């Protein structure tokens, strides 16, 4: 019906949804990996301090 202009049915809404969706994926993955950093360095302090 349309591919540019209606802002709901016109390729641009859609591709934007895909874009920011994938960026939500990115952001959360960064959070998870940040947690993994904290847990690695955390086990290091635990293991050596505990030692």
């Amino acid at each position: 019906d349309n591919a540019a202009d209606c802002a709901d049915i016109g390729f641009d809404a859609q591709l934007k949804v895909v874009d920011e969706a994938i960026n939500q994926v990115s952001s959360q993955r960064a959070k998870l990996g940040a947690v993994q950093n904290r847990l690695e360095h955390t086990i290091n302090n635990l293991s050596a301090s505990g030692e």
Partner: protein, 51 residues
């Protein structure tokens, strides 16, 4: 029915195309004017009118 193309992997990066010919298309007054300007291509007034 703009025969657009899509190019960019992002939004709006499209092309516009224009395709208009037909056997009923001839001298572009605005359109098929009358017996002339489209329909000498179709009806070909050279029957005996041209005599």
């Amino acid at each position: 029915k703009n025969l657009v193309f899509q190019i960019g992997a992002n939004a709006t990066q499209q092309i516009s195309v224009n395709i208009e010919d037909m056997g009923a298309d001839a001298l572009g007054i605005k359109e098929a004017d009358g017996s002339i300007a489209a329909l000498h291509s179709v009806n070909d007034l050279d029957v005996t009118k041209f005599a």
